[PDB]
Amino acid sequence: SKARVYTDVNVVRPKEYWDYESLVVQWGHQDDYEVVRKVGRGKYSEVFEGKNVNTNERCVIKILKPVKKKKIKREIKILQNLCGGPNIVKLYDIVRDEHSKTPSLVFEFVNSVDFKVLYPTLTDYDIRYYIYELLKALDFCHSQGIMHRDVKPHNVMIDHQLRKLRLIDWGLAEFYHPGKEYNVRVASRYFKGPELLVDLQDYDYSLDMWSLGCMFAGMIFRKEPFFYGHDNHDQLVKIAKVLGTNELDHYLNKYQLDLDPQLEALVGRHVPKPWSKFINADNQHLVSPEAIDFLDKLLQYDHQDRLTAREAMDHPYFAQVKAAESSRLRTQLEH
Ligand code: NA
Ligand code: NA
């Protein structure tokens, strides 16, 4: 399998762009920063609000847990390559402790909450707006040869007053090289695409579009997580109970994959459950025929069949939000 969009970005670009294992990290000065307040704990890092001790400027300090140097260099290189792109978090500095050599990443202060915190106070219009903003981040990173590989509500930070979205936590992101077999142990279970669950290792940017579809289904149907499996096998079972097993058979045959016998027995046989069966009185204000059609075009087993980020932005569901962006950009271009 190879990506059908942005296929050769890292073939055309030289090794200095994507060869993160060779990066010579330009460390800043740890003494410039001080932790102020803990913000969150995660599997690979702890996040704090911090300050520059020289200027009192606020920042976010992400203290990385012990991991291989290659993974740290990867995140740094990706953040450096994407810095300044639309709706991508901005890396400001990289420092490490004098004695332990533990690295920290220093980011702009984001002044935001994650997408889930916002769910209860968002309307249909706000969902269309913020999903479009997330699509802009994904189209940009994909266009720069990078897959995020961990799209989920906690990695989408929103400053709701400024109507500003940022895609954060690039620690699982990778460069896309056509032909490369990647580790399938990425993303978070409920957002893993079927490629990760059937051991299709030569996946691409389209993984992020599955993850986005899972987020979108959870939002519009008020069912979080939408696919709630109890392990990686059961995650495929939950998907198959909705998409059905006929299309799973087609996918496996197309990519010359054989389900593990245990997984085959767990998945069994299932007819599809139409999207309309998830509508109820409590979520109907967020659902429309356009929303269902958009979702259906994201949640396809075959990664090549899914909408790309740019194709998603052109879907009728976003027609008004796209038009508003186009008009704004026009006036700024005339200015
Ligand atoms: Na994760
Ligand atoms: Na297909």
From Swiss-Prot:
Choose any GO biological process term that the UniProt entry carries and state it: response to UV-C
UniProt-annotated location(s):
Nucleus; Nucleus, Nucleolus; Cytoplasm
Null phenotype?
A: No visible phenotype under normal growth conditions, but the triple mutant cka1, cka2 and cka3 show altered circadian rhythms and delayed flowering under long day conditions.
InterPro entries for this protein = CK2_alpha, Kinase-like_dom_sf, Prot_kinase_dom, Protein_kinase_ATP_BS, Ser/Thr_kinase_AS
Question: Catalysed reaction per UniProt?
Answer: L-seryl-[protein] + ATP = O-phospho-L-seryl-[protein] + ADP + H(+); L-threonyl-[protein] + ATP = O-phospho-L-threonyl-[protein] + ADP + H(+)
Gene Ontology CC entries for this record: cytoplasm; nucleolus; nucleus
Tell me the organism's taxonomic lineage. Answer: Eukaryota, Viridiplantae, Streptophyta, Embryophyta, Tracheophyta
Q: Which UniProt keywords are present, listed alphabetically?
A: ATP-binding, Cytoplasm, Kinase, Nucleotide-binding, Nucleus, Serine/threonine-protein kinase, Transferase
Q: Where is the active site?
A: D150
Show the disulfide pairing.
none
**Domain Protein kinase intervals:** 33-318
**Class of the enzyme per the UniProt entry, highest EC level:** transferase
Q: What is its EC number?
A: 2.7.11.1
- Residue positions annotated to bind ATP are V39, G40, R41, G42, K43, Y44, S45, E46, V47, K62
Task: Name the coiled-coil region(s).
Answer: none
Species of origin reads Arabidopsis thaliana (Mouse-ear cress)
Which family does the record claim for this protein?
A: Belongs to the protein kinase superfamily. Ser/Thr protein kinase family. CK2 subfamily.
The UniProt subunit note reads as follows: Heterotetramer of two catalytic alpha subunits and two regulatory beta subunits.
Quote the function comment for this protein.
Casein kinases are operationally defined by their preferential utilization of acidic proteins such as caseins as substrates. The alpha chain contains the catalytic site. The tetrameric holoenzyme CK2 is composed of two alpha and two beta subunits. Acts as a circadian clock component that maintains the correct period length through phosphorylation of CCA1.
The molecular function GO annotations come to: ATP binding; protein serine kinase activity; protein serine/threonine kinase activity
* PANTHER family per the UniProt record, alphabetical: CASEIN KINASE II SUBUNIT ALPHA, CASEIN KINASE II SUBUNIT ALPHA-3
- Protein name, per record: Casein kinase II subunit alpha-3
May I ask which residue range the UniProt record assigns to the signal sequence?
Answer: none
